[PDB]
Amino acid sequence: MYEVKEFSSGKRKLEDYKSIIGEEEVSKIQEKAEKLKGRSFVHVNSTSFGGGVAEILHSLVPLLRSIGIEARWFVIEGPTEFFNVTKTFHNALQGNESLKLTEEMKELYLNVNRENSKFIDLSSFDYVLVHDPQPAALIEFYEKKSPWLWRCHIDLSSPNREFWEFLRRFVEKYDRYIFHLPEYVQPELDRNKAVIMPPSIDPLSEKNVELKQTEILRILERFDVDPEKPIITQVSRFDPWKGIFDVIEIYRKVKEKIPGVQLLLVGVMAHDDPEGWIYFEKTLRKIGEDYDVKVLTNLIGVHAREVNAFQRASDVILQMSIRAGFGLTVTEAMWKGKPVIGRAVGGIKFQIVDGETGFLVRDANEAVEVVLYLLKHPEVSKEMGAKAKERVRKNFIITKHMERYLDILNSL
Ligand SMILES: O=c1ccn([C@@H]2O[C@H](COP(=O)(O)OP(=O)(O)O)[C@@H](O)[C@H]2O)c(=O)[nH]1
Numbered sequence: 001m002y003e004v005k006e007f008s009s010g011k012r013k014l015e016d017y018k019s020i021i022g023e024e025e026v027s028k029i030q031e032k033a034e035k036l037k038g039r040s041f042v043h044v045n046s047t048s049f050g051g052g053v054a055e056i057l058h059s060l061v062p063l064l065r066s067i068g069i070e071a072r073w074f075v076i077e078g079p080t081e082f083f084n085v086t087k088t089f090h091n092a093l094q095g096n097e098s099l100k101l102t103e104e105m106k107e108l109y110l111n112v113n114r115e116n117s118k119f120i121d122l123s124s125f126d127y128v129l130v131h132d133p134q135p136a137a138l139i140e141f142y143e144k145k146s147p148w149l150w151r152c153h154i155d156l157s158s159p160n161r162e163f164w165e166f167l168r169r170f171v172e173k174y175d176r177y178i179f180h181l182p183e184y185v186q187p188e189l190d191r192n193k194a195v196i197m198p199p200s201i202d203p204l205s206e207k208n209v210e211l212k213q214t215e216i217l218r219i220l221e222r223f224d225v226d227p228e229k230p231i232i233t234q235v236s237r238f239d240p241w242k243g244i245f246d247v248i249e250i251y252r253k254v255k256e257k258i259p260g261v262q263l264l265l266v267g268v269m270a271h272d273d274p275e276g277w278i279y280f281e282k283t284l285r286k287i288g289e290d291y292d293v294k295v296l297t298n299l300i301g302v303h304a305r306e307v308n309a310f311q312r313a314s315d316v317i318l319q320m321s322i323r324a325g326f327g328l329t330v331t332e333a334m335w336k337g338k339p340v341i342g343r344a345v346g347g348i349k350f351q352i353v354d355g356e357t358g359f360l361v362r363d364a365n366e367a368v369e370v371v372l373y374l375l376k377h378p379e380v381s382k383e384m385g386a387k388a389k390e391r392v393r394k395n396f397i398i399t400k401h402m403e404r405y406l407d408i409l410n411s412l
Helices: 013-023 023-032 050-067 080-093 102-113 138-140 160-169 213-222 244-257 275-285 305-314 328-333 347-350 364-376 378-393 398-409
Strands: 039-043 068-075 127-131 148-151 178-179 193-198 230-235 262-267 293-297 316-319 338-345 360-361
Touching: 013 023, 013 244, 023 398, 039 050, 050 068, 068 148, 080 102, 080 127, 080 316, 102 138, 102 262, 127 138, 138 178, 148 262, 160 398, 178 338, 193 293, 213 305, 230 305, 244 262, 244 275, 244 347, 262 275, 275 293, 316 364, 328 378, 338 347, 338 364, 360 378, 364 378
Parallel strands: 039 068, 039 127, 127 148, 148 178, 178 193, 230 262, 230 316, 262 293, 316 338, 338 360
Antiparallel strands: none
């Protein structure tokens, strides 16, 4: 078990968002953090590099620090055989009931947890937070002296029975279990001690920071995207259930009345995800030689800062997922003042206030209607965008995230 001590984000402090959330709120935050001044608030997880959770901590910890809370972050060390197992665990908890949990696995998992537990005494801290499966087992390698929290960043509505009965021996121990949505909260747990904490976006990260027009245009020009013509965009992983083919249909139908429209299919996927890459090849083959459709991914060098650009340069953003988690991509768009059009699924129905900040549609043709409405009425779009931005400022910002945590430490 290692510690971060540092933070890529830098010396993030509540103050760095004063301009964004206003002083009344900066205060309301500081206040709720006084009652917890000098307390120990540690975070444990499986990596400080790859991942959003990791990216969230690099900003979240510093913040907690600069507000009066001795926040600290520790990571878990392990051999490949441990992460491949946790990958399975991961995929198992998120359905895929074709996975088998063996003893060689439980032993490995539990052992790795034992070892990393003898490096730093976690029971000593006023508050301990454990992120995702990998370090769940930790909770039974110390005598509890303070509350322990389980943070879930995945779906637990339809988990592989075998695997859940095993993890549940650890999760049930913690004082409160935190989930993104009131759907991931397995029944084997006591809803009284469960907590709903949607994830959040950090306004000052590569993905959400405000770029300067010149850079947006450099990126637009680099990937051959015309900022002078209309643009619709769906940022998302490439898989069978993200509505990607529907989007392609929507773009085509819209293109009948607006021949200049361009479609941006944006998406960063890890190299160890053949599933995603096969759906990627499939997309391109369906798109055919229509270069008004841009398929942008990290294979061609698209990353957070470029994704940032594609989103900002967009006139309308889509999210036609058939099955979805929280949908941070929807959150990012909403933050960039863009009106989203998407299916009422997972976190997309929770974030979009239909008719106010964007639209919730049931099919592709309904999505076509609205893409034209919005494209036809830029001022309406501007409005929905402005409201979508506020909703985020007031609900899904990393500072509102922290405040939520505070609310939780003031209820134990
Ligand atoms: O193609 C992608 C897919 C995801 N993300 C990042 O991953 C987060 C969204 O994860 P998501 O909510 O889409 O997971 P899901 O809810 O779909 O299971 C966002 O913050 C993005 O920065 C990205 O940049 N490009």
